[PDB]
C-alpha cells in the first residue's frame, strides 16, 4: 500500500511534492501582478496609512505598492490586507508597515504585488529532514506506524479519569466517551467526526486529560486560524491554563481568543517590571532595543514552558519562540483538512502519542498544483493511515440539524450509523410563518427549469433564471423572519456567484443592505461552518462532481435546507439520481409559484 521502508525514502517523496507546490505558488503569486491601479489614501486612528485599490486573498497577507508615475516620489512600500473584495464591493485594503514616506499626493499610476512566503513550505520541508535525521522527533513505534511497518499494538498505562467528562465542557455522549476513553490508552487514533459530532469537545476533552497527567505541555494543532481558535476558547473553558501562538503578521487582529495569544499574555505581566516600561515606550532606543528583547525572549519562555496546552496552526508549530521544545502528547484537530507534510511539521516535535481528528468523508486538503496533487499531495496523513488500516473511531451523535436534513447524508455517506442529539423541535423557528410543502420536513427541492451560460469572463458558468429563483427564496425567509446573516447561499460557479451578488442588488424587491449580510459562496468556503438555513444553487466541478462535496453542502444547515437545480440535467451524476428520488418519496420535489407551492412528476 501506502507503505514506506524508512523515513529516508519518505522525505525522498514528500520533499519534491513540496518543492513543487511552493514554487507553483511562487509563479501563480508573481503573476498576480497588475499595474494602472488607482488608490485612495487614509488615516486610521492609530496614525498607520492605509490604502484603499480595486483590481480588474486572505487578511493578513502581503502586498507590495509601488508608485510608478511622472513625478518624483518613485517608492516602494509594504503593507498588509485588511479587507478583501465582498458583497460590499470588488475593492482591497492595505496598511503599510512603515507610513513615513508614502505618497498620499498622488493617486493613479500604482502597481500591486502580491509578496510570496516560503515560510510555511520551508517548515513542511525542514520537518520532514527532521524526520529522517533525528531520531528523537518520534517515538519509534509512531515511526513504524507512520511508515506503515506492522508493529503489535502498545497500551499507554495511563491514570485513566474516573469521569470523561470535563470540567466546562458539555457532558459526553456514549461514542466520545468510548472516543476519549480508547485515545488515552493508544501512542496513535484516528478520530471519525462527521458534521456536529462533538470534534472540537471531545479534542478539548482529551486535551484536558492529557493536560491533568505529570508530563510537559500538550501541543494542540489545526490548519486554520479558525480552527485553532475554536479548538483554543474550549481549551479554556475547562480552566487550563493556554497559550494561543499566532504567526508574527497575524498578531495584529481580534478573536475570541485573543486575550490567549502570547504577544498579548506578555503585554501583562506583574513578574517582568522592565519589560512593561520598554514596551510603554514606543509608543525605540538602540540600549533599550537589546533590553527588550531579551525581555521579551524570557517571557514567552516562561509563559510557553509552563502552559498546560500551547494552541498552533499545524504550520505555527515551526515558530521559532517553539525553539527545542519537545512535546510528549500531539492532537490535531480538523486534520484531513491539512496535507501530510502541514501535519508532520508539530508531529516531529517530539510525539510519543499523536491522535488526529477530522473527517475523510469531507472536503481534502487545498493543492494548487494540481501536478503535485494527483502524485500524492492532496492526501491528508489522516486519510493515509484509513488506507493503511487504521480504523477511526466514530462520533456518532450529530447536534447541528434537524433529524430530517440528517437523513440522507448519514445514509449515503456513513453507512446509516449517525444519531440525532436534536430533535425536530429542537430545530424549528418560533413566530416562523414560512410554510414548507411538508411541516415536519424543513428542506425541498424547487424545480427549476433554467438554462445556463457561459458569462463573458472566462471558463465559468452561471444560471440566469436559478439565480432568480433563489433570489425569490432569500427574499421569502428574511420577510418571513429569519436573519440575513443565518442564510447561506452555496453554488459550485464563480460565474453564478459574482452574478447573484449583483442581481439582489440591480432588481431585487428590498434595499442591498439585508442581501449584503447573506452569504454567497462555494463549498470550499463553507467548510467547518454552519447557518440556520441552506440554498444550494446547482447551476447544473463543485458540489456535483465529488461525492464529499455534496455531503458538505448538505450538512450545512441547522434549521432549513433548499436545494434549486435543474432535476432532468442532474440525474446525470448518478448521487444525484439518487438524492432527487429520495426527495420525491418525502414530498418534496416541489415545482410551481413559491407561494402556492405544489409538486412536480418528472
Ligand atoms: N456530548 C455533548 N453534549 C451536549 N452537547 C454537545 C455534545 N457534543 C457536542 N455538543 C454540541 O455541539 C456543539 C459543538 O460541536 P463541535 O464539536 O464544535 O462541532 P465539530 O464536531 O464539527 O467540531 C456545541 O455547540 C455543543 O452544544
Ligand atoms: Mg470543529
Same mark, same amino acid.
Given at each position: 500500500?501506502?507503505?514506506?521502508?524508512?523515513?529516508?525514502?519518505?522525505?525522498?517523496?514528500?520533499?519534491?511534492?513540496?518543492?513543487?507546490?511552493?514554487?507553483?505558488?511562487?509563479?501563480?503569486?508573481?503573476?498576480?501582478?497588475?499595474?494602472?491601479?488607482?488608490?485612495?489614501?487614509?488615516?486610521?486612528?492609530?496614525?498607520?496609512?492605509?490604502?484603499?485599490?480595486?483590481?480588474?486573498?486572505?487578511?493578513?497577507?502581503?502586498?507590495?505598492?509601488?508608485?510608478?508615475?511622472?513625478?518624483?516620489?518613485?517608492?516602494?512600500?509594504?503593507?498588509?490586507?485588511?479587507?478583501?473584495?465582498?458583497?460590499?464591493?470588488?475593492?482591497?485594503?492595505?496598511?503599510?508597515?512603515?507610513?513615513?514616506?508614502?505618497?498620499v499626493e498622488v493617486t493613479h499610476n500604482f502597481q500591486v504585488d502580491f509578496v510570496w512566503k516560503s515560510?510555511?513550505?520551508?517548515?513542511?520541508?525542514?520537518?520532514?529532514?527532521?524526520?529522517?535525521?533525528?531520531?528523537?522527533?518520534?517515538?519509534?513505534?509512531?515511526?513504524?506506524?507512520?511508515?506503515?511497518?506492522?508493529?503489535?499494538?502498545?497500551?499507554?498505562?495511563?491514570?485513566?479519569?474516573?469521569?470523561?467528562?470535563?470540567?466546562?465542557?458539555?457532558?459526553?455522549?456514549?461514542?466520545?466517551?468510548?472516543?476519549?476513553?480508547?485515545?488515552?490508552?493508544?501512542?496513535?487514533?484516528?478520530?471519525?467526526?462527521?458534521?456536529?459530532?462533538?470534534?472540537?469537545?471531545?479534542?478539548?476533552?482529551?486535551?484536558?486529560?492529557?493536560?491533568?497527567?505529570?508530563?510537559?505541555?500538550?501541543?494542540?494543532?489545526?490548519?486554520?486560524?479558525?480552527?485553532?481558535?475554536?479548538?483554543?476558547?474550549?481549551?479554556?473553558?475547562?480552566?487550563?491554563?493556554?497559550?494561543?501562538?499566532?504567526?508574527?503578521?497575524?498578531?495584529?487582529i481580534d478573536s475570541p481568543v485573543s486575550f490567549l495569544a502570547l504577544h498579548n499574555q506578555i503585554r501583562?505581566?506583574?513578574?517582568?517590571?522592565?519589560?512593561?516600561?520598554?514596551?510603554?515606550?514606543?509608543?525605540?532606543?538602540?540600549?533599550?532595543?537589546?533590553?527588550?528583547?531579551?525581555?521579551?525572549?524570557?517571557?514567552?519562555?516562561?509563559?510557553?514552558?509552563?502552559?498546560?496546552?500551547?494552541?498552533?496552526?499545524?504550520?505555527?508549530?515551526?515558530?521559532?519562540?517553539?525553539?527545542?521544545?519537545?512535546?510528549? +502528547?500531539? =492532537?490535531?484537530?480538523?486534520?484531513?483538512?491539512?496535507? @501530510?507534510?502541514?501535519?508532520?511539521?508539530?508531529?516531529?516535535? !517530539? *510525539? /510519543?502519542?499523536?491522535?488526529?481528528?477530522?473527517?475523510?468523508?469531507?472536503?481534502?486538503?487545498?493543492?494548487?498544483?494540481?501536478?503535485?496533487?494527483?502524485?500524492?499531495?492532496?492526501?491528508?496523513?489522516?486519510?493515509?493511515?484509513?488506507?493503511?488500516?487504521?480504523?477511526?473511531?466514530?462520533?456518532?451523535?450529530?447536534?447541528?440539524?434537524?433529524?430530517?436534513?440528517?437523513?440522507?447524508?448519514?445514509?449515503?455517506?456513513?453507512?446509516?450509523?449517525?444519531?440525532?442529539?436534536?430533535?425536530?423541535?429542537?430545530?424549528?423557528?418560533?413566530?416562523?410563518?414560512?410554510?414548507?410543502?411538508?411541516?415536519?420536513?424543513?428542506?425541498?427541492?424547487?424545480?427549476?427549469?433554467?438554462?445556463?451560460?457561459?458569462?463573458?469572463?472566462?471558463? +465559468?458558468? =452561471?444560471?440566469?433564471?436559478?439565480?432568480?429563483?433563489? @433570489?425569490?427564496?432569500?427574499?421569502?425567509?428574511?420577510?418571513? !423572519? *429569519? /436573519?440575513?446573516?443565518?442564510?447561506?447561499?452555496?453554488?459550485?460557479?464563480?460565474?453564478?456567484?459574482?452574478?447573484?451578488?449583483?442581481?439582489?442588488?440591480?432588481?431585487?424587491?428590498?434595499?442591498?443592505?439585508?442581501?449584503?449580510?447573506?452569504?454567497?459562496?462555494?463549498?470550499?468556503?463553507?467548510?467547518?461552518?454552519?447557518?440556520?438555513?441552506?440554498?444550494?444553487?446547482?447551476?447544473?466541478?463543485?458540489?456535483?462532481?465529488?461525492?464529499?462535496?455534496?455531503?458538505?453542502?448538505?450538512?450545512?444547515?441547522?434549521?432549513?435546507?433548499?436545494?434549486?437545480?435543474?432535476?432532468?440535467?442532474?440525474?446525470?451524476?448518478?448521487?444525484?439520481?439518487?438524492?432527487?428520488?429520495?426527495?420525491?418519496?418525502?414530498?418534496?420535489?416541489?415545482?410551481?409559484?413559491?407561494?402556492?407551492?405544489?409538486?412536480?412528476?418528472?
Amino acid at each position: 500500500g501506502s507503505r514506506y521502508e524508512d523515513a529516508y525514502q519518505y522525505q525522498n517523496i514528500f520533499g519534491p511534492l513540496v518543492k513543487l507546490e511552493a514554487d507553483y505558488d511562487k509563479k501563480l503569486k508573481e503573476s498576480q501582478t497588475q499595474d494602472n491601479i488607482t488608490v485612495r489614501w487614509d488615516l486610521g486612528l492609530n496614525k498607520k496609512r492605509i490604502a484603499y485599490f480595486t483590481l480588474p486573498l486572505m487578511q493578513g497577507d502581503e502586498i507590495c505598492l509601488r508608485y510608478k508615475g511622472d513625478l518624483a516620489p518613485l517608492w516602494k512600500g509594504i503593507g498588509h490586507v485588511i479587507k478583501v473584495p465582498d458583497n460590499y464591493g470588488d475593492e482591497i485594503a492595505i496598511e503599510l508597515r512603515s507610513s513615513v514616506g508614502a505618497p498620499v499626493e498622488v493617486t493613479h499610476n500604482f502597481q500591486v504585488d502580491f509578496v510570496w512566503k516560503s515560510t510555511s513550505f520551508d517548515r513542511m520541508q525542514s520537518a520532514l529532514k527532521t524526520f529522517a535525521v533525528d531520531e528523537t522527533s518520534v517515538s519509534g513505534y509512531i515511526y513504524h506506524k507512520l511508515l506503515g511497518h506492522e508493529v503489535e499494538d502498545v497500551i499507554i498505562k495511563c491514570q485513566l479519569p474516573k469521569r470523561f467528562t470535563a470540567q466546562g465542557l458539555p457532558d459526553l455522549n456514549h461514542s466520545q466517551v468510548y472516543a476519549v476513553k480508547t485515545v488515552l490508552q493508544r501512542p496513535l487514533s484516528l478520530i471519525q467526526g462527521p458534521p456536529g459530532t462533538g470534534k472540537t469537545v471531545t479534542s478539548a476533552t482529551i486535551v484536558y486529560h492529557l493536560a491533568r497527567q505529570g508530563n510537559g505541555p500538550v501541543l494542540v494543532c489545526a490548519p486554520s486560524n479558525i480552527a485553532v481558535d475554536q479548538l483554543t476558547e474550549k481549551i479554556h473553558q475547562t480552566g487550563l491554563k493556554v497559550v494561543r501562538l499566532c504567526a508574527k503578521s497575524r498578531e495584529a487582529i481580534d478573536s475570541p481568543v485573543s486575550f490567549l495569544a502570547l504577544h498579548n499574555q506578555i503585554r501583562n505581566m506583574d513578574s517582568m517590571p522592565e519589560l512593561q516600561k520598554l514596551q510603554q515606550l514606543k509608543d525605540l532606543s538602540s540600549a533599550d532595543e537589546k533590553r527588550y528583547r531579551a525581555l521579551k525572549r524570557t517571557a514567552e519562555r516562561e509563559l510557553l514552558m509552563n502552559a498546560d496546552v500551547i494552541c498552533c496552526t499545524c504550520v505555527g508549530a515551526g515558530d521559532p519562540r517553539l525553539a527545542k521544545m519537545q512535546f510528549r +502528547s500531539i =492532537l490535531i484537530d480538523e486534520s484531513t483538512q491539512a496535507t @501530510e507534510p502541514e501535519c508532520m511539521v508539530p508531529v516531529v516535535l !517530539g *510525539a /510519543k502519542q499523536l491522535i488526529l481528528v477530522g473527517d475523510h468523508c469531507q472536503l481534502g486538503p487545498v493543492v494548487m498544483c494540481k501536478k503535485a496533487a494527483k502524485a500524492g499531495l492532496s492526501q491528508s496523513l489522516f486519510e493515509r493511515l484509513v488506507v493503511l488500516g487504521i480504523r477511526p473511531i466514530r462520533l456518532q451523535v450529530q447536534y447541528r440539524m434537524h433529524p430530517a436534513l440528517s437523513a440522507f447524508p448519514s445514509n449515503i455517506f456513513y453507512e446509516g450509523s449517525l444519531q440525532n442529539g436534536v430533535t425536530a423541535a429542537d430545530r424549528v423557528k418560533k413566530g416562523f410563518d414560512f410554510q414548507w410543502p411538508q411541516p415536519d420536513k424543513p428542506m425541498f427541492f424547487y424545480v427549476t427549469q433554467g438554462q445556463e451560460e457561459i458569462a463573458s469572463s472566462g471558463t +465559468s458558468y =452561471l444560471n440566469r433564471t436559478e439565480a432568480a429563483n433563489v @433570489e425569490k427564496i432569500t427574499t421569502k425567509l428574511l420577510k418571513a !423572519g *429569519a /436573519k440575513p446573516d443565518q442564510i447561506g447561499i452555496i453554488t459550485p460557479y464563480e460565474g453564478q456567484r459574482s452574478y447573484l451578488v449583483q442581481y439582489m442588488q440591480f432588481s431585487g424587491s428590498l434595499h442591498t443592505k439585508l442581501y449584503q449580510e447573506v452569504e454567497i459562496a462555494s463549498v470550499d468556503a463553507f467548510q467547518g461552518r454552519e447557518k440556520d438555513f441552506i440554498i444550494l444553487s446547482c447551476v447544473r466541478i463543485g458540489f456535483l462532481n465529488d461525492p464529499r462535496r455534496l455531503n458538505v453542502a448538505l450538512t450545512r444547515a441547522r434549521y432549513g435546507v433548499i436545494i434549486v437545480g435543474n432535476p432532468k440535467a442532474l440525474s446525470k451524476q448518478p448521487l444525484w439520481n439518487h438524492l432527487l428520488n429520495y426527495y420525491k418519496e418525502q414530498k418534496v420535489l416541489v415545482e410551481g409559484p413559491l407561494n402556492n407551492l405544489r409538486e412536480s412528476l418528472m
